[PDB]
């Protein structure tokens, strides 16, 4: 953002940035969930604080 | 010598049962609050 032109952007980012591979290697793929939210507590104490 | 003796008895199979049904809930009420305490873990670390 700010004075960049976007076309410039681009046709610069093509020539730097296309380098980097887009087809997964091993065909991996991140595996996230709708992960839990516990009740628990943590009570670290150092009295002298 | 005892007349309220079938009353008494009456009352006495309602209580039995009455309590037969609230004991295991208030001991499960005193294990739900407690639960916090039973199953807390503690640890020490000192600095070095
Ligand atoms: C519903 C199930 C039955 C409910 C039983 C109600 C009885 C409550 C009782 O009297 O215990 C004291 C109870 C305290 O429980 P607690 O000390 O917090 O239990 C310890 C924790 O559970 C943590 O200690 P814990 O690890 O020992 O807890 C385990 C134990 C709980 O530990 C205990 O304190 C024992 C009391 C409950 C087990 C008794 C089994 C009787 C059936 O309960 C069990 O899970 C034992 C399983 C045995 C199963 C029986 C085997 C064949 C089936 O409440 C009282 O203090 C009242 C006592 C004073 C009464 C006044 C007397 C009148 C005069
Ligand atoms: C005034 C202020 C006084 C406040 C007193 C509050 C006391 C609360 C203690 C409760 C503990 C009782 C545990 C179980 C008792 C029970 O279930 O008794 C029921 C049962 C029902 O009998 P029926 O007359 O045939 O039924 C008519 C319709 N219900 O009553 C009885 O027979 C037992 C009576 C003895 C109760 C004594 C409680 C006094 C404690 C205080």
């Known amino acids: 953002a700010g004075g960049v032109e976007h076309q ?3 046709d610069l980012a093509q020539k730097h940035l296309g380098g980097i591979p887009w087809t997964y290697a091993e ?3 991140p595996t996230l969930t709708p992960c839990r ?3 628990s ?3 670290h104490r150092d009295d002298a604080l | 010598s005892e007349p309220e003796h079938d009353h008494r008895k009456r009352m ?3 209580m039995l049962m009455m309590m037969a049904l ?3 809930l208030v001991y499960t009420i005193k294990r739900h609050k407690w639960s916090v305490l039973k199953s807390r873990k503690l ?3 000192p600095p070095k």
């Open chain 1, 27 to 29: 065909d991996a793929v």
């Open chain 2, 12 to 14: 006495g199979l309602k």
């Open chain 2, 43 to 45: 640890a020490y670390r």
């Open chain 1, 8 to 10: 410039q952007l681009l």
């Open chain 1, 37 to 39: 939210f516990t009740g």
């Open chain 1, 41 to 43: 507590e943590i009570r």
């Open chain 2, 22 to 24: 609230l004991v295991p």
